[PDB]
PDB file of C-alpha atoms and ligand atoms in Angstrom:
ATOM      1  CA  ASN O   8     -27.888 -67.037  12.930  1.00  0.00           C
ATOM      2  CA  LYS O   9     -26.944 -65.626   9.544  1.00  0.00           C
ATOM      3  CA  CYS O  10     -28.898 -64.064   6.714  1.00  0.00           C
ATOM      4  CA  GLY O  11     -28.719 -65.061   3.055  1.00  0.00           C
ATOM      5  CA  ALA O  12     -27.930 -61.500   1.949  1.00  0.00           C
ATOM      6  CA  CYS O  13     -25.638 -59.934   4.510  1.00  0.00           C
ATOM      7  CA  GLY O  14     -24.836 -62.600   7.008  1.00  0.00           C
ATOM      8  CA  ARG O  15     -25.290 -60.247   9.968  1.00  0.00           C
ATOM      9  CA  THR O  16     -27.151 -61.454  13.075  1.00  0.00           C
ATOM     10  CA  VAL O  17     -30.763 -62.624  12.626  1.00  0.00           C
ATOM     11  CA  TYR O  18     -31.892 -63.873  16.038  1.00  0.00           C
ATOM     12  CA  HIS O  19     -35.379 -63.145  17.363  1.00  0.00           C
ATOM     13  CA  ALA O  20     -36.303 -59.503  16.816  1.00  0.00           C
ATOM     14  CA  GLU O  21     -34.422 -58.882  13.576  1.00  0.00           C
ATOM     15  CA  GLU O  22     -35.538 -62.073  11.820  1.00  0.00           C
ATOM     16  CA  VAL O  23     -38.549 -63.432  10.037  1.00  0.00           C
ATOM     17  CA  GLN O  24     -38.635 -67.175   9.474  1.00  0.00           C
ATOM     18  CA  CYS O  25     -38.747 -68.252   5.881  1.00  0.00           C
ATOM     19  CA  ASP O  26     -38.597 -72.051   5.592  1.00  0.00           C
ATOM     20  CA  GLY O  27     -35.193 -73.332   6.765  1.00  0.00           C
ATOM     21  CA  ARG O  28     -33.319 -70.040   7.039  1.00  0.00           C
ATOM     22  CA  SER O  29     -34.370 -66.658   8.262  1.00  0.00           C
ATOM     23  CA  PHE O  30     -33.341 -63.379   6.773  1.00  0.00           C
ATOM     24  CA  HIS O  31     -33.050 -60.087   8.415  1.00  0.00           C
ATOM     25  CA  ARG O  32     -36.173 -58.233   9.221  1.00  0.00           C
ATOM     26  CA  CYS O  33     -35.351 -55.259   6.952  1.00  0.00           C
ATOM     27  CA  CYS O  34     -32.796 -56.980   4.713  1.00  0.00           C
ATOM     28  CA  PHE O  35     -35.357 -59.507   3.620  1.00  0.00           C
ATOM     29  CA  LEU O  36     -35.077 -60.816   0.092  1.00  0.00           C
ATOM     30  CA  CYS O  37     -35.916 -63.126  -2.787  1.00  0.00           C
ATOM     31  CA  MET O  38     -33.329 -65.890  -2.881  1.00  0.00           C
ATOM     32  CA  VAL O  39     -33.812 -65.897  -6.671  1.00  0.00           C
ATOM     33  CA  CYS O  40     -33.848 -62.443  -8.190  1.00  0.00           C
ATOM     34  CA  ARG O  41     -33.252 -60.478  -4.993  1.00  0.00           C
ATOM     35  CA  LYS O  42     -35.983 -57.794  -5.017  1.00  0.00           C
ATOM     36  CA  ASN O  43     -36.397 -55.604  -1.904  1.00  0.00           C
ATOM     37  CA  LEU O  44     -38.767 -57.859   0.021  1.00  0.00           C
ATOM     38  CA  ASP O  45     -40.063 -57.184   3.523  1.00  0.00           C
ATOM     39  CA  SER O  46     -43.212 -57.774   5.581  1.00  0.00           C
ATOM     40  CA  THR O  47     -45.378 -57.534   2.458  1.00  0.00           C
ATOM     41  CA  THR O  48     -45.715 -61.265   1.927  1.00  0.00           C
ATOM     42  CA  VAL O  49     -42.996 -63.809   1.101  1.00  0.00           C
ATOM     43  CA  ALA O  50     -43.245 -67.143  -0.694  1.00  0.00           C
ATOM     44  CA  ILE O  51     -41.414 -70.435  -0.870  1.00  0.00           C
ATOM     45  CA  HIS O  52     -41.153 -72.641  -3.917  1.00  0.00           C
ATOM     46  CA  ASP O  53     -39.063 -75.803  -3.707  1.00  0.00           C
ATOM     47  CA  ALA O  54     -35.591 -75.184  -2.244  1.00  0.00           C
ATOM     48  CA  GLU O  55     -35.463 -71.395  -2.581  1.00  0.00           C
ATOM     49  CA  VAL O  56     -37.391 -68.274  -1.637  1.00  0.00           C
ATOM     50  CA  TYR O  57     -39.358 -66.460  -4.263  1.00  0.00           C
ATOM     51  CA  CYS O  58     -40.343 -62.925  -3.424  1.00  0.00           C
ATOM     52  CA  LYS O  59     -43.593 -61.100  -3.999  1.00  0.00           C
ATOM     53  CA  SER O  60     -43.053 -60.295  -7.681  1.00  0.00           C
ATOM     54  CA  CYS O  61     -41.444 -63.438  -9.150  1.00  0.00           C
ATOM     55  CA  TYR O  62     -43.727 -65.794  -7.216  1.00  0.00           C
ATOM     56  CA  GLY O  63     -46.953 -64.303  -8.538  1.00  0.00           C
ATOM     57  CA  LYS O  64     -45.658 -63.771 -12.098  1.00  0.00           C
ATOM     58  CA  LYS O  65     -43.782 -67.024 -12.711  1.00  0.00           C
ATOM     59  CA  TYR O  66     -46.526 -69.165 -11.212  1.00  0.00           C
ATOM     60  CA  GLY O  67     -49.491 -66.759 -11.469  1.00  0.00           C
TER      61      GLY O  67
HETATM   62 ZN1   ZN B 101     -29.273 -59.416   6.093  1.00  0.00          ZN
HETATM   63 ZN1   ZN B 102     -37.921 -62.165  -7.043  1.00  0.00          ZN
END
């Protein structure tokens, strides 16, 4: 439905599933810091999305 960043239309093509929500395919982010995330990886920790950087550096 709606992305955490914009709130434009994530649907099928322009979404990647990340736990409960999806974000847009390009406009894909850390729910914490908000680094420019994409189809590198992604992570989840607890209730929020951690990106590539803050996941591997906070937790190792
Ligand atoms: Zn978006
Ligand atoms: Zn981050």
